[PDB]
A paper describes a structure:
The histone chaperone chromatin assembly factor 1 ([name]-1) deposits two nascent histone H3/H4 dimers onto newly replicated DNA forming the central core of the nucleosome known as the tetrasome.
To gain insight into how the [name] region binds to DNA and facilitates [name]-1 function in vivo, we determined the structure of the yKER at 2.81 Å resolution. Crystals grown of a maltose-binding protein (MBP)–[name] fusion construct contained four copies of the MBP-yKER per asymmetric unit. The yKER extended from the MBP as an almost entirely solvent exposed continuous alpha-helix. In the structure, we saw no evidence of interactions between yKER helices or formation of any tertiary structure, consistent with the definition of an SAH domain. The circular dichroism (CD) spectrum of the [name] showed characteristics of only alpha helical secondary structure, including the positive absorption band at 195 nm and two negative bands at 208 and 222 nm, validating in solution the structure of the [name] observed in the crystal. We noticed that the yKER SAH is particularly enriched in positively charged residues, unlike the Myosin 7a SAH. These residues are biased toward one face of the yKER helix and confer a net positive charge along most of the length of the yKER, which is concentrated toward the N-terminal and middle regions.
Residue numbers in the entry: 3 to 477
The structure:
């Protein structure tokens, strides 16, 4: 339908703020803007867009946007050099598929180093200081660092710090035949990761839940997580800080960068209108603020608005780690990379393979046939369909108990503050009467004290003249 903008954005984002920016776009141009949040739009959009229908604009991470363009679902955006300068240069690389821009960057997301301020006022700036910092904290019944070691997304920051990379990115493209997994840099990064486990500084069987709980309970001093986990730490009432990830051999850690992007439908009749909306209404200070006020975006690609968000050290550390991080490729071959590195880490942490053997097979399995891997996943999904469907229900059973625990926390924080605001309001009215009665009393006691001195002088002048005439009259 030409002449009307339809926007699809996930339900966990600030869509109400996005609708307000749409109403502002409608108040100026008269074009209706309807912001919807359908369920599972990452899988529903690729089907509706292929048949012509669908939204004019769709919001989602840039990783899925790669296959969208290969399918022909996203139109090539055309921002001028002026607007390209409004966003950080590295964010455009995440929305560039096949050398052409196919999405507008909105928000930037990357892993950071979260530390307990009560245990560590000064967090370590280097990975080499953690072994000695853990030996110190082990004497006091705690540990230094505990983060997810199962998925390679959490272990890549250390593995790629010395010179690792998924696929080499050049001229705006990706070389599936050039995987940077078994080089001298990745070998040192993974060796130091394994040496941390062999020296009993980390346990190889630590996943996401084990790490999130150990930090919330105050048992470990540090953890590695993204802005999505800040809510869970706020409920634990742990004085935590979000800082830059440690360096390894002088080089900073390289976490994968995820960019929330807004793409224009390739079959949309309102491509020019979507361009006016995204560049001149959404990607502005007033626009992004309306969305961030409804649901925080974290670090955003807009420079002018990142300055104000960067006053929050947590968002400032996320953008710093993102700029030092690695743009996550949107190439479908990435699936082979995820599976290859996953087994490379697990086999190296369990002693199945050495660091050299694990990375050697990983660089080979990264170039594995993707369709063969998909069929391999289909065979295992059916083979373990029972325990898997029970695991998914258990995670949904714990997510409802973990979102009710947050609702109970903000209910507690809203109750104590609303009661403290009325409690101080009573004291302000208490001393207001206590000082009003003190003013009425002290002002009328000093006033009468002046009448005491004036009347006493009148008495002194009257008794002295009455005595004067009483002595003058001699009998």
């Amino acid at each position: 339908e030409e002449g009307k903008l339809v926007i699809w954005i996930n339900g966990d984002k600030g869509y109400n703020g996005l609708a307000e920016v749409g109403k502002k776009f409608e108040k100026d141009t008269g074009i209706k803007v309807t912001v919807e949040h359908p369920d599972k739009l990452e899988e529903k959009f690729p089907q509706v867009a292929a048949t012509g229908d669908g939204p004019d604009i769709i919001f989602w991470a840039h990783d899925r946007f790669g296959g969208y363009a290969q399918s022909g679902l996203l139109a090539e955006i055309t921002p001028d050099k002026a607007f390209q300068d409004k966003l950080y240069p590295f964010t455009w690389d995440a929305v560039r598929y096949n050398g052409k821009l196919i999405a507008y960057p909105i928000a930037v997301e990357a892993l950071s180093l979260i530390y307990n301020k009560d245990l560590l006022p000064n967090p370590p700036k280097t990975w080499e200081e953690i072994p000695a910092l853990d030996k110190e904290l082990k004497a006091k019944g705690k540990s230094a660092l505990m983060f997810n070691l199962q998925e390679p997304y959490f272990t890549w920051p250390l593995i790629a710090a010395d010179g690792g990379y998924a696929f080499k990115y050049e001229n705006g493209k990706y070389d599936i035949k050039d995987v940077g997994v078994d080089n001298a840099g990745a070998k040192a990064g993974l060796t130091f990761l394994v040496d941390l486990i062999k020296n009993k500084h980390m346990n190889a069987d630590t996943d996401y839940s084990i790490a999130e709980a150990a930090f919330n309970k105050g048992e470990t001093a540090m953890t590695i997580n993204g802005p999505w986990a800040w809510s869970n730490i706020d409920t634990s009432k742990v004085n935590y800080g979000v800082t830059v990830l440690p360096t390894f051999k002088g080089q900073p850690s390289k976490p994968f960068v995820g960019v929330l992007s807004a793409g224009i439908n390739a079959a949309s009749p309102n491509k020019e209108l979507a361009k006016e909306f995204l560049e001149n209404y959404l990607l502005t200070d007033e626009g992004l603020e309306a969305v961030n006020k409804d649901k925080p975006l974290g670090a955003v690609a807009l420079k002018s608005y990142e300055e104000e968000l960067a006053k929050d050290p947590r968002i400032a550390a996320t953008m710093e780690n993102a700029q030092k991080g690695e743009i996550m490729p949107n190439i479908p071959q990435m699936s082979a990379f995820w599976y290859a590195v996953r087994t490379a880490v697990i086999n190296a942490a369990s002693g199945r393979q050495t660091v050299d053997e694990a990375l050697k097979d990983a660089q080979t399995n990264s170039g594995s046939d993707i369709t063969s891997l998909y069929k391999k996943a289909g065979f295992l999904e059916v083979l373990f369909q029972g325990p898997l469907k029970k695991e998914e229900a258990k995670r949904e059973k714990e997510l409802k108990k973990q979102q009710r625990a947050e609702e109970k926390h903000r209910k507690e924080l809203l109750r104590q503050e609303e009661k403290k605001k009325k409690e101080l309001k009573v004291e302000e009215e208490r001393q207001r009467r206590a000082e009003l009665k003190k003013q009425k009393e002290e002002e009328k006691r000093r006033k009468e004290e002046a009448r005491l001195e004036a009347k006493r002088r009148k008495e002194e002048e009257r008794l002295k003249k009455e005595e004067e005439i009483r002595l003058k009259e001699e009998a």
